[PDB]
């Protein structure tokens, strides 16, 4: 999971 | 007359001030959920109710995994912002  | 800001609906992927999560392989939590709920309920429920299902799906079925403790085991709640003046059904 990564963040925008 | 009607307000110039009337009849707008903003379906935000996350709450004000928060990061928004995206899985590099499955796509973003929000869009994954939004498309799933539209495919399943667009011919059955009013749009706000569909978005509420999206809120519940994102809120319950997703939790981040990260090697960085700071970003691990986090949650997300989408944010529905409505200035609509009528109910919205994609079917008729």
């Amino acid at each position: 999971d990564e963040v925008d | 007359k009607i307000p110039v800001e009337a009849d707008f609906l903003y379906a935000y992927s996350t709450a004000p001030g928060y990061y928004s999560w995206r899985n590099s392989k499955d796509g973003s939590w929000f869009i994954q959920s939004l498309c799933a709920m539209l495919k399943q309920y667009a011919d059955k429920l009013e749009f706000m109710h569909i978005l509420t299902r999206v809120n519940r799906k994102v809120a319950t079925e997703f939790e981040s995994f990260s090697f960085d403790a700071t970003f691990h085991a986090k949650k997300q709640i989408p944010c529905i912002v409505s200035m609509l003046t009528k109910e919205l059904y994609f079917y008729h």
Binding site: - | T14, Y18, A73, K75
Partner: protein, 146 residues
């Protein structure tokens, strides 16, 4: 005729309307923004989903801030008379009230203003939907065990 309530938007126009999808995955090196891996999965899912709802889907990839504004301005200047609604999906990096073009930020207010009830008359009284997949800050939700 019989009693008319007008509690739901008229969605039986000849066309459901446009669904503009702005899919920004690759950003200019100078911006220091990372590539948004997985956004193509989102873009494809949205394209198919709205296609099935009968929207005229238009996918745009890696648009600069200038191209985003130009696209929105042009779209707002089209004749939406025979369209029931308007949908715009934004997939990119972001911060509160901002969406990123490949070369810099764009205020969401600037994009939405083009569709104001007084600036896009063919959409006045019709639902204008903006779906935004982007950060709105840097806060993290620790959650609570239920």
């Amino acid at each position: 005729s019989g009693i008319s309530l007008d509690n739901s938007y008229k969605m039986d126009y000849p066309e459901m309307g446009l669904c503009i999808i702005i899919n920004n995955k690759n950003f200019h090196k100078s911006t220091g923004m990372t590539s948004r891996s997985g956004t193509d999965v989102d873009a494809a899912n949205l394209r198919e989903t709205f296609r099935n709802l009968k929207y005229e889907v238009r996918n745009k990839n890696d648009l600069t801030r200038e191209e985003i504004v130009e696209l929105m301005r042009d779209v707002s200047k089209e004749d939406h008379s025979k369209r029931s609604s308007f949908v715009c999906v934004l997939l990119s990096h972001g911060e509160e009230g901002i969406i990123f073009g490949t070369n810099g930020p764009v205020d969401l207010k600037k994009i939405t203003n083009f569709f104001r009830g007084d600036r896009c008359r063919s959409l006045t009284g019709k639902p204008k939907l903006f779906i935004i997949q982007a950060c709105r800050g840097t806060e993290l939700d620790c959650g609570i065990e239920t």
